[PDB]
Amino acid sequence: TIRVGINGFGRIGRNFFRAVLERSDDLEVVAVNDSKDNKTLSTLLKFDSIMGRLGQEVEYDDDSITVGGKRIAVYAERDPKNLDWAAHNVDIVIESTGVFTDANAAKAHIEAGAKKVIISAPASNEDATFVYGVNHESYDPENHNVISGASCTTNCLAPMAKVLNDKFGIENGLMTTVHAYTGDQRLHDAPHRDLRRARAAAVNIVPTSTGAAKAVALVLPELKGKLDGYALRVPVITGSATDLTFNTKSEVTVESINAAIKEAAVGEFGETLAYSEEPLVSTDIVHDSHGSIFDAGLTKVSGNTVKVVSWYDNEWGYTCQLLRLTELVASKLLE
Amino acid sequence: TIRVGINGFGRIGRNFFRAVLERSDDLEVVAVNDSKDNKTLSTLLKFDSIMGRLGQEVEYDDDSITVGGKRIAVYAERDPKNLDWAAHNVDIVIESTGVFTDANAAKAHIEAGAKKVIISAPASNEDATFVYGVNHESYDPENHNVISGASCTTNCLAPMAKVLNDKFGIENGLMTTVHAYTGDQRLHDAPHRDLRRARAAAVNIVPTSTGAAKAVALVLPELKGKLDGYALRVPVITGSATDLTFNTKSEVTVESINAAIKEAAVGEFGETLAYSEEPLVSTDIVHDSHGSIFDAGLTKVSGNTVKVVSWYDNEWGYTCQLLRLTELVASKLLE
Amino acid sequence: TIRVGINGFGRIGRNFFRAVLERSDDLEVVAVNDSKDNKTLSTLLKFDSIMGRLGQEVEYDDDSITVGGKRIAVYAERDPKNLDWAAHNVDIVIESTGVFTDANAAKAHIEAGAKKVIISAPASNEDATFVYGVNHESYDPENHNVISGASCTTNCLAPMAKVLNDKFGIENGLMTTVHAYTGDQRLHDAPHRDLRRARAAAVNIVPTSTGAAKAVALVLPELKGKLDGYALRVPVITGSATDLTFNTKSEVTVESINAAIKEAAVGEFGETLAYSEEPLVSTDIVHDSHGSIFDAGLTKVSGNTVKVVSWYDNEWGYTCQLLRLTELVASKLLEH
Amino acid sequence: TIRVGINGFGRIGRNFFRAVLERSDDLEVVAVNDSKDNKTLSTLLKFDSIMGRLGQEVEYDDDSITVGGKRIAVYAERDPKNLDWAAHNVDIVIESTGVFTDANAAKAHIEAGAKKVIISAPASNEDATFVYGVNHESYDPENHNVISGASCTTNCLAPMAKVLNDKFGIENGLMTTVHAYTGDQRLHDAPHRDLRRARAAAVNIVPTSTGAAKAVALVLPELKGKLDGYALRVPVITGSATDLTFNTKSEVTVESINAAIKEAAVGEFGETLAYSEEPLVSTDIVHDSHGSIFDAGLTKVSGNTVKVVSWYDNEWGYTCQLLRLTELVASKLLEH
Ligand SMILES: NC(=O)c1ccc[n+]([C@@H]2O[C@H](COP(=O)([O-])OP(=O)(O)OC[C@H]3O[C@@H](n4cnc5c(N)ncnc54)[C@H](OP(=O)(O)O)[C@@H]3O)[C@@H](O)[C@H]2O)c1
Ligand SMILES: NC(=O)c1ccc[n+]([C@@H]2O[C@H](COP(=O)([O-])OP(=O)(O)OC[C@H]3O[C@@H](n4cnc5c(N)ncnc54)[C@H](OP(=O)(O)O)[C@@H]3O)[C@@H](O)[C@H]2O)c1
Ligand SMILES: NC(=O)c1ccc[n+]([C@@H]2O[C@H](COP(=O)([O-])OP(=O)(O)OC[C@H]3O[C@@H](n4cnc5c(N)ncnc54)[C@H](OP(=O)(O)O)[C@@H]3O)[C@@H](O)[C@H]2O)c1
């Protein structure tokens, strides 16, 4: 068991906690840092609009939240310099606040006694970025100390893109992610730096930018400069689909595109990328642990133009990818 | 034409602007104070998730927003002491920020050159509170200088309660308002001082407290101590219903309860309170200008226990009540 | 293993099937009658927009569906007279079509081999109506052969109405249930016998009738003529609350109303009626197995007027209550 | 006044009626055929969950509804053969039931007295298909008697596909339309021939087919075999976007793609196709009368791969396009 700390007990932080509880044999969360009182934090952990009730008992005091008898230390230092991770023998910190995506700032956790930091988001100045299943073999336990698990969408797109580029080659592609609304958006029309994300999220199709397609290049260098895209935020609370349209020099049919995915979606990689011929709708992939669920029923081909669609639970699927990455780091040298 | 200023260009502020444009012959909005840039403010005025597009042309510069050729001065003073309302000959300021519901603080607008302040909310230390149609005859143009238009729900409940208490007498009543979600609520589960309003608004029935039933006593003193209630926030963006269950010493039937409303819902009062026998659903009362739309089809009676239900557009219906109050003030002595 | 058949494999039928898999050791569903083809039936069983995926493999053919290796015989007979329940030795049929709530028609399942019929709905002409935890002890295994499990709302209302009446006496009460939309409402403005339920369900507060407060008299005769109410259908897919306002002759406080429910909400009754002081919203009671979750935080008192509020998963909570009734039935004599 | 009758008084029929009241001086609806009773018809006309209240008094009887003092004859004949359109001198029938998109069946309205039938949908065996603004000039008043106004998606796609093909040449293109749910989808998980549209519409992203990108070839023959796509149905009640990704042989930038649409989007064509640089979300195009609102802010270019996005109100925008086609028809000879 390697001991884990979470900085930021938001949606991603709480997902990660639950995912460890549900899915991990070799990690334990033993401390959390967040800016709120333990009554509030413990209530949000216990009850969730998306995931339902935590199955375990939750209690709290002024120092901690106890979950199924296991005491979780809770801190509220807004600067990670004031933390002491070594005091709880935390080796890995999950950096999920959203305000330390800069590795030069996330480094504070290591100064505060951790050995590894995993940023649950696109990062800057990081040692490395991983999409589990795609480039995790390149993790270097001595030199990759502050890393990034990339974005939900990148974790959906990159597995699919790896397989198709490997098999047919992708010249250029443009992505539309049709995505659940997220907490950056407004409930009612109100000021926002993005004048579209300003608009009432649960009654609008809301177009917004995302770096997730360009970010594929970080984990698949062969696709640098060849992918871009954007997001349409729509009224579901979780569950998203990545629609990629690309040009290939290969001569391709619907059936050969699908066969390539089916043939790759197997073994350990198939825990990242799944192949489905089912009549899927978003609610079917809620709490699905794959990073990418390829929908063979949606594949289209016109000439050398290809459209493929992969599903993802932008919360849970992403979190399970991050958990896979965390298990890898925890399985290798920690100093 | 009496010239009006709005402090706070949120949902209520923008509703009020539109209501003046659509419905008023004797008021004009000539200045606005708000903490945002004019590109953002002008975009939110022009496009609305609830009301649709403003029919008029909107332009802006760094000093103003011009609406159908009429230049609206815009300020961004966070303290109303720094404002100068007299410079634009504004007589009435609508105080719609939410952070000057204290009349001792709203008074600043009068020091800044206005003559009257109307708080678009339950207030404290106010000269008087009005529900138009219920107690507006008691407005005293010399001594009522900082006033309150009360809450959306109170504007729905008080008209109905006046008629029923007048005709049958109400001993005690308890209200449930089944209410559209509002901007105080969270889109995704997140910290909030109210741990229920913390929960994703568009997928939950969310119980929360409201003073609106006790506040009836401010405008109908005869009901002090006899009304209380709460709110169930539900997933519609606007449109609400007030369900009041009360005990009466009178012997009453469904048909006599309804006849009393029908008989009162007439003339000017009938612009506040309507009587309907239609098969209404919330979307039918969106942009309805009444404060209260009594639904005769929902009236129930068991013994001396009575249940009545009135609809309201918590945005537009409320705003039209506030506009009626503003026209009254504007029609009398301004000093 | 008491063998169960389901007539009508819609929301309630599929909930019942799942609840049997999840919560019963004594019951097994061996046969289903429904109007649809088996490809459709099996897809709707495998995948559920509310309950998520069934955690068991599903296959189908012209005659059956196989769930986790167990063959369920499937028929599609519009008329129950043309069924042979004896052919697979089913003893209890759950009648969940919606269209045979008249016991005079549902009786047809007994003629076709069943020993018992449980109507998943308010019924007419039935031997008996039950809210488990309230009056199930009056179940008569000789004379109660076609029975009603009453409605979702009744299964929420009756348990707290029993406790509070018994403690304080209810003079009259009026109820509003703020209720998830149901399958009979229209997605877009379209024809319906109820001109309000005609109206786009996911964007409207939709008022509609419910017999629930009057049907409580069937199970608590002491409350006959003392209750009425209506529903507001709102845009959530499941999860509901019943808001009851009543006047009493007793002297009551918030603390005293709430203490009455807490005392009673224990033991086996406590699996029907829960007592909560949690900050609940509707998603928190989705897939809750209680018929009634009393929300102590919502209790109000004004003179002699009392308001109380209880939650229910109108799908799963109701289904769990119905399973509790089915287990009771199946634990006694199944003659004939 | 050219007299119009409507067969099928559903979403599209009621939109058409309203659009005639709102935007036409030349057309008048004098008769309606629909399967429902007049109390229901008149209620659904008066009150609309999307469009709000009709601003006119509505009354009804056994034979008619009266809207702002004008009597509309109402029939309910399942079979168009039993209608007499001549009886009220209607010249154009809008065929909006959904079930007579085969011109071989819709022809029955001409036998029953109509001079022209306009099918509010993709059709089979029709004289002609039109997207107003794209190919309406080819309308032949002698030989085009039963015609299609094509689909909502086609009326969004074809206008920008015309402009960009003409300017740059489209090699192939694939489309996704992110589309408001429609009335055929199910509110709760329930049977449907499309097992995805079976699934609770207001809580799901629901993939489904559309002929729209292949139906563009009917109106722009130059694009035959070059377009395909599908729909994602999402939880908004109306408002949709068409996302088209195509590869071209030309050298194109974002600025150049966008400039091509701006140039073309003027005059009468500009009432079909708008050019926007606004920060649009779907509520902003609700009740917009254009068939296609090009969103310049969404244009992307990657090498020779181009993505463009246009909005449409799949109810009102489509209806306005159809009204534009009906006015055209009604401005020429109505013989026979
Ligand atoms: N769909 C998804 O949700 C998704 C998918 C992929 C990636 N991600 C990434 O995951 C990260 C987390 O996103 P989220 O959805 O979880 O957002 P969130 O719900 O707002 O979580 C962020 C949390 O950080 C806490 N926080 C902020 N500053 C802090 C500080 N100085 N010290 C301690 N705690 C602090 C906040 O606590 P308070 O609320 O008390 O301020 C908040 O609860 C982001 O970087 C996001 O881009 C999200
Ligand atoms: N259903 C309803 O909406 C409803 C019904 C009845 C009564 N009311 C009452 O109406 C009032 C307004 O509510 P709302 O729904 O309009 O909320 P809102 O949308 O948040 O509007 C409030 C606005 O005030 C602005 N503001 C805050 N502090 C300011 C300052 N110091 N100077 C200038 N502007 C400032 C904010 O601008 P920024 O956003 O840029 O910070 C915000 O846009 C509240 O008191 C509420 O209780 C609302
Ligand atoms: N919240 C709730 O859903 C709720 C709560 C409490 C009680 N109930 C009660 O439970 C009953 C079922 O409701 P529900 O929500 O499950 O509705 P539903 O989803 O429509 O279920 C009805 C099912 O019966 C089938 N069916 C109808 N007529 C049939 C016939 N003649 N032969 C065979 N199968 C037939 C239908 O097949 P098709 O789908 O092919 O038509 C459908 O699968 C109703 O009486 C309702 O009051 C419902």
Ligand SMILES: NC(=O)c1ccc[n+]([C@@H]2O[C@H](COP(=O)([O-])OP(=O)(O)OC[C@H]3O[C@@H](n4cnc5c(N)ncnc54)[C@H](OP(=O)(O)O)[C@@H]3O)[C@@H](O)[C@H]2O)c1
């Ligand atoms: N977004 C859109 O809605 C959209 C956009 C573009 C094109 N369209 C097309 O427009 C057509 C109509 O669609 P819609 O959305 O308006 O569907 P809808 O709401 O179901 O309209 C169909 C109407 O036709 C009536 N009807 C059906 N069969 C009939 C018959 N034999 N005789 C008389 N009346 C009959 C129905 O009456 P009942 O209600 O009693 O069944 C209903 O009012 C479809 O072909 C569709 O593809 C729709």
